[PDB]
Amino acid sequence: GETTDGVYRVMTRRGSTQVGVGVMQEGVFHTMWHVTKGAALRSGEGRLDPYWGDVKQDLVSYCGPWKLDAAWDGLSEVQLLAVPPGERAKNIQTLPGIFKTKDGDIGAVALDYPAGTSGSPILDKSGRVIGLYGNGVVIKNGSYVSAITQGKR
Amino acid sequence: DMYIERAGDITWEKDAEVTGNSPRLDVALDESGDFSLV
């Protein structure tokens, strides 16, 4: 239904709960897999059918292929456009940490917002989405660090 | 059922709160998409 680009809350009905967040871009809804787990979505009247998904990337798109291809430059600060449950969309600026894997380095933001913020877009200074928030690790005590998870066009 | 609601534009804001450090971690990604400290 709602075709418009922008950030979206993904909601569920038992009452109602926000389980995650997503990005609509060029007619495709991008979110993280663990949020929807490949379940179809309702956009008002219409329905969004799953198009592509990958558990290892923890990503899933609807109505079309993955459209987000921008990446962190490994230097500049980014902004988490966090959409917390019951809260207005807000931009949190931060300098990304680094996930050092055997297959290369991944940008990582040391921000810890509620589970319903999963899938919130991470933006560069141009306003382009360089990744989604909600998949990472835990250091010490409650200190969650999320990778900047991006797919491929 | 699961449904979506628009929450705003995709926009960089100048009045952004700034927080968080920049940790460098050795991590591994397994088949299930789970990260783990190395």
From Swiss-Prot, chain B:
Residue segments, region Disordered: 8-30
Membrane topology: Multi-pass membrane protein
Chain intervals for the UniProt region annotation (Interacts with and activates NS3 protease): 4-38
Record topology, Cytoplasmic segments: 1-38
Subcellular location, record wording: Host endoplasmic reticulum membrane
Self-association and partners: Forms a heterodimer with serine protease NS3. May form homooligomers. Interacts with human SPCS1. Interacts with non-structural protein 2A.
Domain observations: The central disordered region transitions to ordered by binding to NS3.
Function: Required cofactor for the serine protease function of NS3.
The protein, known as: Serine protease subunit NS2B
Organism, as annotated: Zika virus (ZIKV)
